Amino acid sequence: MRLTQGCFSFLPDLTDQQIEKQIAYCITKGWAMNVEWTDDPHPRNSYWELWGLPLFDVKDPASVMFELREARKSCAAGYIRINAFNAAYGTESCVMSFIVNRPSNEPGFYLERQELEGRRIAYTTKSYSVQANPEGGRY
Amino acid sequence: MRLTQGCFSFLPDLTDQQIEKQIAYCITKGWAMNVEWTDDPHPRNSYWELWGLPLFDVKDPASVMFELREARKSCAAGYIRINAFNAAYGTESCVMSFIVNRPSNEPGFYLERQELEGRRIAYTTKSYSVQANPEGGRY
């Protein structure tokens, strides 16, 4: 299965030139950029692991491209994403996020159904990779 | 274990001639026919996967037999079922359903018991095939 989190997941994996252009668009707005990693893709897993501090005043995509290159050869198999933050009054939140590295294969998830009162069910979403191996060796 | 969902599961697997006769009975009533597939046989799994659109005005079982033949050679190991729908005022629901293809072997299910207040138990039914492999490779 293909994980569909992010804004461009219905398009093929993007090339390095493609990635650089999107970065160039965020810096022209004055946004701060950062890179994150994880091996637990549950949709309610809000905090991915941080790769260094956010690049606040960098004004050249080459600096962002370099950091991503390092993570790629340094981190274990899993997922990598690039985010952009806007600290303007009225926003003070993230304004863009897309995946930029995936595992060789992802088995996906399945549902568990606990029966409670009347006809009500309490659902739990479960990951095949997580349940099988500890962090660092899931993919 | 043998899954007992459907109207003829206490009888041996039906032959192609047997299946054709039941189809001929539903079309003489004017019902619409469709074919579905799944690899998760939980009794509360209401939505199986659809194989094309329902055949509304087809008036010859040969058309239904052909579609079932295709699914058999196209879909992965699992279960296949044929349903008949009646859109008449007062009904507007399914009026027949039977299994027409099974996996080589089905391990079945087991129960988990969570203890709550007093002597009350919250039960959960679990499938051996589902918990072991992702969709597409369970059988």
């Binding site: 294969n105 088995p107 095949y128 990779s129 349940q131 099988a132 191996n133 060796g137 899931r138 993919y139 | -």
Partner: peptide, 8 residues
């Protein structure tokens, strides 16, 4: 060896 054993 303990990573490819499970989670295909």
């Amino acid at each position: 060896k303990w990573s490819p054993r499970g989670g295909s």
